[PDB]
């Protein structure tokens, strides 16, 4: 869960955005981003194949219908 | 006022109490077999060529019957 750090005692910061990076995220902001990330989220081809088999049977019924004339 | 920690090569983020690692492994093994995003392109071109040749069968059955 929570991290495990090398240096024991914390250090204050004074830097700028143009200097070194730092994670400074307020809690409701990260909560809302977790909500927004959570909320933002074949055999029919075999069905087509089997229906095409039925079309093949319909077609051979048509072939048996046509040759009798 | 702000308090932080200076980065190191010996600071380690642990596993998230193995209650989220298990759903990571679930998401690992529920997608080992599925959409490979490779035959989707083959699916598109096969569907399109199939539509093309079926419409060609329509033209053949419309003209060769006369």
């Amino acid at each position: 869960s929570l991290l495990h750090t090398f240096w024991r005692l914390p250090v204050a910061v004074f830097f700028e955005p143009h200097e070194e990076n730092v994670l400074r995220c307020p809690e409701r902001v990260l909560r809302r981003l977790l909500e927004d990330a959570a909320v933002t989220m074949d055999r029919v081809r075999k069905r087509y194949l089997r229906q095409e088999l039925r079309d093949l049977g319909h077609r051979v019924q048509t072939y048996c219908e046509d040759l009798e004339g | 006022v702000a308090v932080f920690f200076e980065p190191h090569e010996e600071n380690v983020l642990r596993c998230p109490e193995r209650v989220l690692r298990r759903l990571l492994e679930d998401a690992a093994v529920t997608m080992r077999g599925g959409g490979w995003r490779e035959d989707v392109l083959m699916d598109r071109v096969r569907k399109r060529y199939l539509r093309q040749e079926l419409r060609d069968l329509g033209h053949r059955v419309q003209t060769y019957c006369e």
């Binding site: 077609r59 072939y63 | 040749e53 079926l54 069968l57 060769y64």
Partner: peptide, 20 residues
């Protein structure tokens, strides 16, 4: 003609089977 039409349809369905 008629047998030619029936044969070309069943053979073209047999080659339709080799897309899927």
């Amino acid at each position: 003609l008629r047998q030619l039409a029936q044969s070309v349809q069943d053979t073209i369905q047999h080659m339709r089977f080799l897309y899927l």
